[PDB]
Write a protein that binds this DNA or RNA. Structure first.
Length: 135
RNA sequence: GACCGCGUGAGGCCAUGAUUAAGAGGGACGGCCGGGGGCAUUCGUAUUGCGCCGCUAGAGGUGAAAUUCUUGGACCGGCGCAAG
């Protein structure tokens, strides 16, 4: 099923890769970003909570996303990386690189790659305290 | 104002009398310069909340966890609003 597309033509979804230090999201939408095609989360594929954000868990999430997209006809993806952002960290998580590689290795093609991490033009105060999270 | 003379007057006379303008200071003036100050105004994302839509079973959190939040739809995505 899906869209009735020609031989050489490809169709684009947008893949939102949200990669925090606790968990990894491999959400795939349409081009408008409104219609979810498939969302598989990195903590859907493991048992321990410590392995939610491991790169092996983001790989398994990335494989079961592309398998779901190609049986809806989606051929290529624009990539949107995303860290936590805001007051929190701006570097994307450990499963950011391994999901993007595994998405490429499973017969899925790549459009643009962008960064849509929330960046405060300012910020409310962070959740640490003044002396700030000592351990 | 000293000084001499002369009728409270009319005089002479003094080279007649005011150091300088501080690499002290105050003040004027000139074109500037500055996250200085006060009042008003404008803007920016973000966060939180909220509506509505989409798909879902986990989300979150940590050294590891649990309290917590979720099929009544959480989290993630999209549009919109609100407030500080």
């Amino acid at each position: 099923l899906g869209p009735q597309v020609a031989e050489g033509e490809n169709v684009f979804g947008v893949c939102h890769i949200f990669a925090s230090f606790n968990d990894t999201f491999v959400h795939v939408t349409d081009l408008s970003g409104k219609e979810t095609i498939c969302r598989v989360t990195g903590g859907m594929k493991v048992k321990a909570d410590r392995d939610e954000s491991s790169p092996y868990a983001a790989m398994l999430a990335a494989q079961d996303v592309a398998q779901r997209c190609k049986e809806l006809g989606i051929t290529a993806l624009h990539i949107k990386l995303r860290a936590t952002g805001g007051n929190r960290t701006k570097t994307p998580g450990p499963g950011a690189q391994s999901a993007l590689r595994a998405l490429a290795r499973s017969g899925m093609k790549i459009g643009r790659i962008e960064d849509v991490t929330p960046i405060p033009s300012x910020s409310t105060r962070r959740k640490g305290g003044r002396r700030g999270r000592r351990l």
